[PDB]
């Protein structure tokens, strides 16, 4: 900011916010808030939960004081020009609204989403780390620099989802086979092909490799149809499941491998950097 | 002779059967008789070496591992103090004395450990990813897996297999004659849950390794509903399992690239090039 | 040919290259909106009317290229570049499917159902139209071309392991639902299960294990399942509990067979 | 002559591929003799090369030695069938590796040969890393026997992946390293020590095992793969 105008009060205020006591105070304040979030456990006494809710109010109050303190010294315009300050401003708004809706209560309980903003305070530690911040930023920027490589993998899931929807859609899951047939069919109400999203989830589960072979066996021929399928015989499922799942496993692995190498070789300079030789990292320290 | 003694000790350790309760195979006594001889010969080796070095004994790292083995072995062997069963567990580290004996393996172990030092920064980043997801999971899935189908008014589980249940339509609903009840042991005998922060960390960790994360998701769907549970597990796998795998391969690839261009490695490759040229010319 | 110049004016024009690119997008979305369960669902009927429009756009785009470019008469031709054959397959399958639906809807569901699966190739037509996506696609093919030499060695080694596995576990993967009856002739009648707080009677069945080693094809599939990591501990347990051909399992009969899977994991 | 021998191997490779569970009797009768004739012909080319080039030239070549091993290995299997009827290992399928010389006529020979040359050159190292990996598996096996050795006799039976005996301990440790059902094994370890109430401190052993084992395997086998392949590339280019 450096206004050199109001040395009486503004500069005294400004020198305080950019001062070693301030940054470590905020650093310690997050860490204490980190401990508070981890102190929740099941079966606690009503006093213990009362203690935790009180601590949360104190922290967010101090962080709101932190925000209003900074905006005075830096200025309203300068405060919003830095992403981290915007991130701090977003979190404090979420924390205030979450408390306000809770203490009023007596309404819809849908907004447990706002409680995530309490955990978002953890990300502020990453500003302190010199090596970790660089490592994440370079790789994240690489995914930005390569948008179309992710599009190819999305097409692989899109094509295989539609095929599974049509070939294996009508397999019956409604029947509960109690000591008859096989209830152990891996095509249940949670792992079905009945809709596009559920087809995608089954593909993702197979991608991570979670008993996909049993899913392949469950999709073979001779399985019961559905009541609304329009077929009243045990003639649902195809022998195409052998090619469907085996080809998907190989193709999914290959495409992710190319994605991994593409990101690695986008930053292969960073990964092979030498401290003795000048690089952009030292150049950034020069500007600082 | 010392190396042969280590190999014999490894064989003796490998020829042991552990029986439940207090049962002992007849060969156990014969196996145990050998321990005094081995601990004595190791102590003799250590003493003869330390008197010569003058205690540069503890200066070398490998000698320290050999030294602490001898102290623990002689501490429990002499007398039957308390339980001291834990002092038997240190005998597990005796196979590692082969590395100390053979200098050709110490060089190899240096190469493996040198490359993992860059991975330490990744591990710190990986730990901070687990902690964030553990905290989020602790807030949303806290104690939700202690509710199954009990008989109406009777504290007995409806069937031999209890399952999570809910009191509302989006979650799984108990049959007509049964009601959801406040307490149940939980899936996987209570081991898989979000109750403490330690349980949450352990539960998140196995999802990072992509093992048994579908069952946790399907259990969560039954307990609460399938509308929002995917937003917690699918990002967990992608950020946790796939992203860190991307970083680990990248960091290791960079380290291998720098390793190959060290002066020592270049000369070894240059010798291989010249030998093959001679073979081609001789052919 | 004056008439050919008319189509080339349409083809070269930007408003015909960009416009179809949305038609690809809408048609792909319409594919993902179909109800798989119920063919007579109201959603499927409406979406079918859309498929008529999408075929019309693709048919219009197919023909004008046929007038524009000779079919096989030039170095650059319609049937010269694979993407045009890929385009040809999608539209031709739809036209054939429409013709057969008409004669009797009820009588031949299977083909009707079969060629309708070919509509999933509509997303793949985006690769040619987007220059940036083709570069990524060419990168993948380049990576495939580079690892082709190692790949051939890979199947040759896995083929050898498949043959060896066949000669060791051929016919030894038969089990009886009642473990007491080792041979097939004994496995007939009723047998008792003693589970907690009940006694029930079920049939005896002579069954083959789900994943087995009977021919080179079954061995390769089982070894692929082992390599990917899923379910290989159970295949290991069936391998170590195999006695003889056409005979039931006996626990712990061959613990030396664990060496086969250990060597397999170190290699592939 | 060189192509004819390769053609015979393809037919020999085909014959062992045909074998299946329930083969027609004529097919089985055909194969039983057919292995004998193929063994004779590949023993026939053994002698003609033995005399044409000489005994000393024969042993110097590595490919001749490899063919000698397959022939001797095939001899062992034939006699073993009479001695202990019931099992056959099909050692003759290892001769299919001779189809890899087809790459000689192609332009891929230089890249593949240098990969083999680099691997054989750095044989002392590759053995050392595998041995170091073996010792780490052995140590985690002996540690498992101390902690969980005697407490998997549950009321539902002893699990196959127990730490009772040493051979059982190795397989359980090996399975955890590959990561398949490492959580189910950990559940047994926790239940063996009082369950969730009193045995959650033993979960550390599986956490350390899978965390180090997963990345140690990556750091050992990728280092072998990257270094030896990289030597092949530069050595190939310098030849060009």
């Amino acid at each position: 900011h450096m206004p050199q105008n109001k040395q009486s009060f503004q500069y005294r205020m400004w020198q305080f916010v950019v001062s070693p006591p301030f940054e470590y105070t905020i650093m310690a304040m997050i860490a204490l808030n980190t401990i508070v979030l981890m102190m929740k456990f099941y079966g606690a006494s009503v006093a213990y939960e009362n203690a935790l809710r009180v601590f949360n109010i104190v922290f967010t109050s101090l962080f709101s004081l932190e925000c209003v303190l900074k905006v005075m010294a830096f200025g309203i315009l300068n405060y919003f020009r830095d992403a981290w300050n915007i991130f701090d401003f977003v979190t404090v708004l979420g924390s205030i609204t979450d408390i306000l809706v809770t203490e009023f209560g007596n309404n819809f309980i849908n907004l447990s989403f706002l409680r995530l903003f309490r955990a978002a305070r953890l990300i502020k530690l990453l500003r302190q780390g010199y090596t970790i911040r660089i490592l994440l930023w370079t790789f994240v920027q690489s995914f930005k620099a390569l948008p179309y490589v992710c599009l190819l993998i999305a097409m692989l899931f899109f094509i295989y989802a539609i095929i599974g929807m049509q070939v294996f859609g009508n397999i019956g899951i409604d029947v509960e086979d109690e000591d008859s047939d096989e209830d152990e069919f891996q095509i249940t109400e949670h792992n079905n092909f009945r809709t596009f999203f559920q087809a995608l989830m089954l593909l993702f589960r197979s991608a991570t490799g979670e008993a996909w072979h049993n899913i392949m066996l469950s999709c073979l021929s001779g399985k019961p149809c559905d009541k609304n399928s329009g077929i009243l015989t045990r003639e649902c499922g195809n022998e195409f499941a052998y090619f469907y799942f085996v080809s998907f496993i190989f193709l999914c692995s290959f495409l992710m491998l190319n994605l991994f190498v593409a990101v690695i070789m986008d930053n292969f300079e960073y990964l092979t950097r030498d401290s003795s030789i000048l690089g952009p990292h030292h150049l950034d320290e020069y500007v600082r | 002779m010392i190396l042969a003694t280590i190999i014999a000790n490894c064989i003796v350790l490998a020829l042991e059967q552990h029986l439940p309760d207090d049962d002992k195979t007849p060969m156990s006594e014969r196996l145990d008789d050998t321990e005094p001889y081995f601990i004595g010969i190791f102590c003799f080796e250590a003493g003869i070496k330390i008197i010569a070095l003058g205690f540069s004994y503890l200066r070398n790292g490998w000698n320290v591992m050999d030294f602490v083995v001898v102290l623990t072995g002689i501490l429990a062997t002499v007398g039957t103090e308390f339980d001291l069963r834990t002092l038997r567990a240190v005998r597990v580290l005796r196979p590692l004395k082969l590395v100390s004996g053979i200098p050709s393996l110490q060089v190899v172990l240096k190469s493996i450990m040198k490359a993992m030092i860059p991975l330490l920064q990744i591990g710190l980043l990986l730990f901070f990813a687990i902690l964030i997801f553990a905290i989020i999971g602790l807030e949303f899935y806290m104690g939700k897996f202690h509710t199954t189908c009990f008989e109406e008014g009777t504290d007995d589980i409806q069937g031999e297999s209890p399952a999570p249940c809910g009191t509302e339509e989006p979650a799984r609903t108990c049959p007509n004659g049964t009601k959801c009840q406040p307490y149940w042991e939980g899936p996987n005998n209570g081991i898989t849950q979000f109750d403490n922060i330690l349980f949450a960390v352990l539960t998140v960790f196995q999802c990072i390794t992509m093992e048994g994360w579908t069952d946790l998701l399907y259990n969560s769907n039954d307990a609460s509903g399938n509308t929002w549970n995917w937003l917690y597990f699918i990002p967990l796998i992608i950020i946790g399992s796939f992203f860190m795998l991307n970083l680990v391969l990248g960091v290791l690839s960079g380290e291998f690239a720098k390793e190959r261009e060290r002066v020592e490695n270049r000369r070894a490759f240059l010798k291989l090039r010249r030998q093959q040229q001679i073979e081609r010319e001789l052919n | 040919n004056p008439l050919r110049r008319l189509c080339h004016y349409i083809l070269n024009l930007r408003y015909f290259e960009m416009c179809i690119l949305m038609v690809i997008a809408m048609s792909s979305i319409a594919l993902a909106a179909e109800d798989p369960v119920q063919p007579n669902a109201p959603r499927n009927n409406v979406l079918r009317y859309f498929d008529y429009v999408f075929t019309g756009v693709f048919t219009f785009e197919m023909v004008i290229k046929m007038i524009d470019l000779g079919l096989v008469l030039h170095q650059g031709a319609y049937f010269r570049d694979l993407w045009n054959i890929l385009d040809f397959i999608v539209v031709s399958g739809a036209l054939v499917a429409f013709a057969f639906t008409g004669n009797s809807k009820g009588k031949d569901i299977n083909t009707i159902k079969s060629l309708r699966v070919l509509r999933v190739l509509r997303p793949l037509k985006t690769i040619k139209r987007l220059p940036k996506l083709k570069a990524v696609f060419d990168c993948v093919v380049n990576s495939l071309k580079n690892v082709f030499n190692i790949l051939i060695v890979y199947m040759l080694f896995m083929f050898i392991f498949a043959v060896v596995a066949v000669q060791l576990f051929k016919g030894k993967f038969f089990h009886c639902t009642d473990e007491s009856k080792e041979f097939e002739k004994d496995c007939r009648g009723k047998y008792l299960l003693y589970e907690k707080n009940e006694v029930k009677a079920r049939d005896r069945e002579w069954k083959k294990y789900e994943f087995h080693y009977d021919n080179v094809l079954w061995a390769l599939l089982t070894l692929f399942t082992v390599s990917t990591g899923e379910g290989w501990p159970q295949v290991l347990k069936h391998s170590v509990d195999a006695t003889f051909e056409n005979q039931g399992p006996s626990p712990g009969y061959r613990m030396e067979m664990s060496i086969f899977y250990v060597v397999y994991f170190v290699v592939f | 002559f060189y192509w004819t021998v390769l053609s015979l191997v393809a037919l020999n490779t085909l014959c062992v591929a045909i074998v299946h569970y329930n083969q027609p009797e004529w097919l089985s009768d055909f194969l039983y003799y057919a292995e004998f004739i193929f063994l004779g012909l590949f023993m026939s080319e053994m002698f003609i090369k033995m005399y044409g080039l000489g005994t000393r030239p024969y042993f110097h070549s590595s490919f001749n030695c490899f063919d000698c091993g397959v022939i001797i290995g095939s001899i062992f299997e034939v006699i073993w069938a009479v001695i202990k009827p019931g099992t056959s290992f099909g050692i003759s399928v290892l001769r299919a590796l001779r189809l890899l010389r087809i790459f000689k006529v192609t332009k891929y020979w230089a890249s593949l040969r240098n990969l083999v040359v680099s691997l054989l050159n750095s044989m002392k190292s590759i053995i050392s890393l595998l041995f170091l990996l073996f010792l780490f598996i052995v140590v985690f096996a002996l540690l498992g026997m101390q902690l969980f050795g005697g407490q998997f006799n549950f009321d539902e039976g002893t699990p196959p992946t127990n730490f009772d005996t040493f051979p059982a301990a190795i397989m359980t440790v090996f399975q955890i390293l590959t990561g398949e059902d490492w959580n189910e094994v950990m559940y047994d370890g926790i239940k063996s020590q009082g369950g969730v109430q009193g045995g959650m401190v033993f979960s550390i052993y599986f956490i350390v095992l899978t965390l180090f084992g997963n990345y140690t395997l990556l750091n050992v086998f990728l280092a072998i793969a990257v270094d030896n392949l990289a030597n092949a590339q530069e050595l190939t280019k310098d030849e060009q």
Partner: peptide, 26 residues
């Protein structure tokens, strides 16, 4: 080889078909 619907433990691998299910039964 435990029958279908009998209580099972996954580490056993004794289940006749498939594996030990989520609910703990074959």
């Amino acid at each position: 080889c435990k029958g279908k619907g009998a209580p099972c433990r996954k580490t056993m691998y004794d289940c006749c078909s498939g594996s030990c299910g989520r609910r703990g039964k074959c």
